[PDB]
Amino acid sequence: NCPPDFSTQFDREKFYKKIIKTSFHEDDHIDLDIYVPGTYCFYLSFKNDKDELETTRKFYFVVLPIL
């Protein structure tokens, strides 16, 4: 639910897509640019071993305010 840029407001339930670059050798790095302090979470969707869709937990991280 991290907004893509500073112009976009924050919404708890509007999540944005990010593509994981699959490789058997190289790990993939995906940046989450944060422009405003607040509560942000992320979860991962993937293709199950049953060819179905599966989802992980929501993992949160807090950006503290600037006083």
Next chain:
Amino acid sequence: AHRTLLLRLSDSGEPVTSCSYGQGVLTLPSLPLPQGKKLGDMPVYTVKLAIPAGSPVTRDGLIWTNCPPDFSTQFDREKFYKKIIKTSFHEDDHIDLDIYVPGTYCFYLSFKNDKDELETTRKFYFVVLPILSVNDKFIPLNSIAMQSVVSKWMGPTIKDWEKVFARVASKKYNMIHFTPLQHRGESNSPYSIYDQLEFDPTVFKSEKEVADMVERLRTEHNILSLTDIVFNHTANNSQWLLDHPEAGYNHKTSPHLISAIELDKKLLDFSEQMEALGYPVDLKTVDDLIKVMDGIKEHVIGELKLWEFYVVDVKQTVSELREKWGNSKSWSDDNIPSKDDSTNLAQFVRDNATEPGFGSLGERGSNKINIDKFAAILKKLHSEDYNNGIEELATKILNDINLPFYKEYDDDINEVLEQLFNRIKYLRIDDHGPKQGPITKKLPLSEPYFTRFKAKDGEEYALANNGAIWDGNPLVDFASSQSKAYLRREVIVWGDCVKLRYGKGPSDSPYLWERMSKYVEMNARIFNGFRIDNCHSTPLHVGQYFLDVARRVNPNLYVVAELFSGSEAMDCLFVERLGISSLIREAMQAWSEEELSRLVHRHGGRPIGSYKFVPLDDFPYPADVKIDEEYCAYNPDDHSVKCVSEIMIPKTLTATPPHALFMDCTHDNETPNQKRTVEDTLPNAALVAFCSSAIGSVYGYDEVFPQLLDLVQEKRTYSCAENTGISKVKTLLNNMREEIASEAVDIEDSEMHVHHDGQYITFHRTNAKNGKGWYLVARTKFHSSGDQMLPRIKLSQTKATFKAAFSLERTGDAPISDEIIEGIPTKLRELTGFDIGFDENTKETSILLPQDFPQGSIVIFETQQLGIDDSLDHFIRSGAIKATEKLSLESINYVLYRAEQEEYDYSEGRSGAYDIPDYGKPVYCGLQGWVSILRKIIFYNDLAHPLSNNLRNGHWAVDYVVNRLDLYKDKEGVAEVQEWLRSRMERIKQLPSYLVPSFFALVVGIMYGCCRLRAMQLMSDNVGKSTVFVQSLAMTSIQMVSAMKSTSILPDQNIAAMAAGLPHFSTNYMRCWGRDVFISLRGLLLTTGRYEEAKEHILAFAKTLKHGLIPNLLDAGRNPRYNARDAAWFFVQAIQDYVTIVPGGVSLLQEKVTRRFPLDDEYIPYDDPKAFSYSSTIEEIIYEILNRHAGGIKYREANAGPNLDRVMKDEGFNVEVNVDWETGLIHGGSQFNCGTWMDKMGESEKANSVGVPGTPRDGAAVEINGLLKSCLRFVLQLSKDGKFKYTEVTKPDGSKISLSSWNDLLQENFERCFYVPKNKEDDNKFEIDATIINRRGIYKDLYRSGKPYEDYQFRPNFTIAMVVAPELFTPDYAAGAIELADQVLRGPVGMRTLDPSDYNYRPYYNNGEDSDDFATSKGRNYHQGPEWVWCYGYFIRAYHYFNFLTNPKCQVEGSAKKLKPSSYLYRKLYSRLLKHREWIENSPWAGLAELTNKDGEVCNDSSPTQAWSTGCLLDLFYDLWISYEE
């Protein structure tokens, strides 16, 4: 030199067909290499792929192709190479595919889908034909004469063969087809090959022995050679079949045929004991067959176990149910059907408790039930104890399961014996096959379906033999599991041969692929090509692999194939992927004379006078293109493919029908003696030789053999009797084709006419380049059907010359030798008496046949069309570029366009547009009117079109093209263009009438292409390098800018004046409109580069300033009309656009005009000397508008009355404008006013709308204030640079306000007044009365309108302010507001003028309405619903701008870290212009309409081409170019 072809692609990556030649293949023309060049010195051909700009394929697009990158790299079918597509929104991308070796090549495109996924198009193939030379002389593919000879009938020695070679060499054949010269099998049939890797031991012993013989044929008699190649079968007695029995389908490899094996060996076992346990061993009664069938009823059918191959063993399942009753048991599914639903319960068990491969065939009891799963259902359905009625229930279910299998069995058995007693009859009882010998071991009752042998591995096998199903699909392998033909006995077999089981590749049959590979490349080293019998039965992947192995050995492999697949499409697909160069067509298949004439018509050529292809208004004309300035950069030794004209747009690659090899008689069809008579051999072979294709014949056809030679049994040898039958005539026919082959090249270069009258068939072969031709009259002898007299043959504008004539007569029967095949004695009598009359006045040739012209005779005439020489094509394809050298962007308008009203202006109403009978007039008087009609005519070769009829009925349209330019002769470059048309049209009139249409369209198309290229050269780079769509939009600038006689933009002179639209806004006072001119000025003049012409319009309108306003109707400079509030601010915006774009554009500010009206608003002093009076500068004019509006204007329209406006009310003439200085907005207008672009005054006397404005836009208009803010921002930065002096502004009282304060006033109050906030909680900071509102999140259409409900109406005018003054809008508010307009107000081509949710929505505009409806009557709906195209331009310009600021997905990181629009934004932009590109493509007028009804519905009253409709779309392309593509 230049061997390049242009292959334009569509938006989906598919090749574009330039002409309609029918179902075909992208074949490249067979041409010799340049002088002294071998394979590898240079590319044979270069295919230029053209990808449209902005197409969905360009998005991360890649061009794939299996073409090797250079000559050193070998060809691989599945190794494709990368090619990068250079994406652009303006410029198309060209990618070259260099080809160094003939063969089969394909290409497909991968791109990024709209789902951000990867997507791929089809594979598109194109064939490069082989290069056939004999010694050092090139052999054109359509001049091949192939003589098919059978090896075993030429003698047992090599010299016995070279005697036959000398005979066919005297007949002047240039190619010999060999039945396979390999060791033959048991039956000695040439196609049942014993050993593939060694030639016939009778004649040859090594490869060098046969290779020397073929090379001897090349050097001695100048004859190339090719053989049959057999892929489908091999002989039934090959020593390698014992070592490798898996090469065919057997009980191991193809287990489904096990049922068919035990039935075949049930007949070899039966046919030998037939007489013992039977009676009719060999009789000829119908009842005699029935007792054999009754013997079949009990001895084979009854002894084959009721066939458990289909039926589940019932009692052997119950036996195995009690056996395992008590193991894996119990079920739980509650979907098990009840025992009442017997049918559904059976199919439930069919899907759950079955072993793999249920229903399909295999071993005897292959179909069986899974017991542990079956009993688990029985315990869940009935009971867990077995004796509780399970034996009854389990058997009842299995019996119901076998019901479809039993009915599948009765339908199979019936076809087994019905095929038997229908084949045994014809086989035995002589109906048409005399062979009722007593059934022996050699000739049993059953034809051998399987070849039995014991292999070297020890085990016994049973391979079968292929054949052909009667009317079955040849693409289905009848030996595979998909067919049941070997079981149901639906196969006509060849006992000589045996299966060849290829799999999905070499993995399924390793030794078979390795052997056939070495067998293919062995003949490829020796011979020049192959011949494939029944190519349709060979699988594609099988034929593809081995033909590519052959081409790696012999790069010039010539492939012939007897291809009769399901349809022409399947025939083309096989030719595409396999690389077939010629298809076999048989002339003996024609049952009657009409069928022969239709066969000859298919392979004869194109109609006489067929249209020639030319680039027209559907091509890009790059200003930076190479040119043959006089069509002279060609050398015959280079052997280069020629461009269409002086413009070097290369020859287009389009699908053409696959080449044909017309055989007058093959080695499988009956002799003319059998099917027809012997005399027909002469006229049949003549009609075949006249076809524009390759021809061939079997040995004995020319030597009139009595009957078809049995390829299996016969052992006699060809006779040494020389020069028998047609041998003399074939020497003439082949020698004549050698003279024609030297110059005839492409499909447009050979034309034909064929006529059939009774037993006569007429053939007229014509070369379209020089006019040389042949005429053949052949009287056919299908039967002796009495005397028939042919009418007088008449040829127009042609002279005829007698060439030769012959008759073939029979002199008894043929000798009966047992050692030598001798033909029928025939006389070849030369004929005379053909009278050739030539009328020296009408230039008409008449031909009368002599009464002594018996059936089986021919007569050949040499003919030459009058007026055509070899130098005609060069004269037409040259000089047009030099003729357009002095053309200007104004003068091109008179050559290409001019509406009929525009032409009436120059001709005082005498000329106009050429009326085409039974059609109408072209849309323009110039060439564009012709090209718009001719493009579809040339594409379909519609020689029956009314224009095509009129062009050959007389020279009216020919002279009309030249005589028009007398009106505009004095203009720049028009005189030299007329002289080129005069000289070319004069030469055309000397041609035959039937050839005028094709040449008329060629001359007009060439000059059109030169005029269109000259336009792109005179324009700017962004236009002269872009797609067809952008250039087509730019050509509209020439449609509107023209000099006239009844009007202009200056009152003293007649110069170029931009018309509002054609044809209803082009003459007198209706042409120039100040509002229309300056909305289109940036697109049509600045984007294109007409800087000087744009200045003239700004200066001319500046002379007629009054009330601080620009007049809507400009009467050249005299008595105008100032009924417009928009014009002055669109005019001042065009000045800003000029200064911004034109280099040194600030010079316009100090240009002095002569204001034709005194500063104080005076009267109409046109003749009063106070008109000229004083001069005004553009800088002063800009300030005069700003200060007059500010100080408050006050005027009533001068010369008021019905003479001015016959419907406007008295209070309507006093219109005014004033600035509310508390907000900074410019207000003005009344409910009797039309001072905006929505100018529609009612005129209905029945609906009482007379004088009632349909859209009175009184008050502050968004466009006016948006342009005001743009003008203020312009003059502020202008004063900062020292180009504008004024900063003071006077108020009606006397106060002064600085221009910056007025600029800040709008910046602080504009959005506050117009924006309707989406939140009701903010309905207090944006001046909103919530009682009257439609939607929120909308920028208002007006402020302080007379009727307040129109303030909150969603209209497309708010985008004009968004484009010219983007600072007035917060990004998030504007982005959501324009997203609503995209969903609601955006039509397909035009912009909806009013929200459909409003009650005044009248989307259909009909100016001619005599109803009582207050709106629709007399067309007051003009701006209340209808979709206008120019607002679409301002819409998408701001749709692109504000989506680039708001949506982060519409932005992407760029070079120099300057953010460029993402492909996601270009994709959304490109989609919203497809309907515009379709419109200008499929419109007779080469532009965009003014208005459109609801949802793309064509409005008849709308002007079909409007200046500001196309000009606002050019504004979008210039925005994207000047900001991102520099």
